Design a protein around this ligand. Structure first.
Ligand code: ZN
Length: 357
């Protein structure tokens, strides 16, 4: 529910390109999650870019590379500027009419394992603010980010605009990335090593975001992962070489036409059912967030749902305990939820005790 503008710097728009964001002096994109790209190729945005020539879109190098592979975003090509990771970079913001000059320093920080995903730290003459985008970091990772600190202590951060997808005490703990990855790996390994005819379908609905899962499975098991499309990774060999559009592989992450219901699926999306007329022996594995209360113990990241079907713990977002740790550490004046699980009322109030206001 973040609508693009932070109170401290209203002339910049982040992860939202419609409505009030049509008057931005600069744009920012944290990652190629579809829900962060609302309005990014709307005719009204194109209309506005034609009549405001010094407006740029800023993002990570990987995000820029991903965007410029898509024909529908190539109208941006002249005006997308990447900023290197953890490299504080001064940007000038131009008032097209009145000529007001505005200078801000932006630093891109890692946000988690989605390709090109970043947090944006903004430092200007109205305080320091952090926009996380979607994020989940390792233990101590924020503490190790030198550019979040000054003189040994955390920077004085006025406001944090953060991913509160699981900002409720019921989502207290989520198994770690390492636990999730190891679980899926060992499940896949135990299946595909039985014979060349044993195959896995990874049921991942989004077109973007699961690439670190595919690359790790591919690296560890020596198999390319089937995908619908890999041209976005044309210039990214470390991702590209773990993927394939050829369906003759033991690991598939191909996707059904988005229109189809889950209950209508009867086979791998790409339609391969046999090799040498030997039927393929298929299990389905669906990445799915699993969580545990404060007083509970974590259980197996793999949940069996049928003879040939499984769910596997996976999260793009921090648990409630991880959110608390992050905000306790940053100790901002304000914390604003980007996502409502409830209302901005339970969640803003849940975060209040971690802030200085
Ligand atoms: Zn396939």
């Amino acid at each position: 529910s973040f609508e693009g503008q932070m109170a401290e710097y209203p002339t910049i728009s982040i992860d939202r390109f419609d409505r009030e964001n049509l008057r931005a002096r600069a744009y920012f994109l944290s990652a190629c999650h579809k829900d962060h790209m609302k309005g990014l190729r709307a005719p009204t945005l194109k209309r506005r870019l034609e009549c405001s020539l010094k407006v740029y879109l800023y993002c990570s190098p990987v995000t820029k590379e991903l965007l410029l592979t898509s024909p529908k975003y190539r109208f941006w090509k002249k005006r997308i500027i990447s900023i290197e990771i953890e490299t504080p970079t001064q940007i000038s913001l131009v008032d097209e009419a009145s000529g007001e000059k505005e200078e801000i320093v932006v630093t891109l920080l890692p946000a988690g394992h989605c390709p090109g995903s970043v947090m944006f730290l903004f430092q200007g003459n109205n305080g320091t603010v952090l926009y996380t985008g979607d994020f989940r970091l390792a233990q101590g990772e924020a503490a190790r980010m030198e550019l979040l600190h000054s003189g040994g202590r955390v920077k004085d951060i006025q406001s944090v605009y953060l991913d509160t997808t699981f900002c409720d005490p019921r989502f207290y703990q989520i198994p770690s990335r390492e636990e999730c990855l190891s679980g899926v790996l060992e499940l896949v390994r135990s299946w595909i090593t039985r014979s060349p005819y044993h195959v896995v379908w990874l049921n991942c609905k989004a077109a973007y975001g699961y690439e670190y899962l595919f690359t790790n499975l591919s690296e560890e098991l020596g198999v390319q992962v089937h995908v619908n499309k890999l041209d976005m990774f044309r210039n990214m060999p470390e991702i590209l070489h773990h993927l394939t559009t050829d369906r003759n592989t033991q690991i598939h992450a191909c996707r059904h036409p988005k229109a189809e219901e889950y209950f209508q699926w009867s086979k791998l999306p790409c339609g391969i059912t046999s090799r040498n007329r030997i039927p393929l022996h298929i299990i389905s594995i669906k990445p799915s967030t699993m969580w545990f209360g404060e007083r509970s113990r974590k259980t197996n990241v793999i949940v069996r749902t049928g003879e040939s079907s499984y769910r596997a713990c996976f999260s793009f977002h921090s648990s409630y305990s991880e959110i608390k740790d992050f905000l306790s550490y940053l100790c901002p004046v304000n914390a604003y939820p980007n996502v409502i699980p409830t209302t901005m009322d339970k969640v803003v109030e849940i975060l209040k005790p971690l802030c200085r206001s």
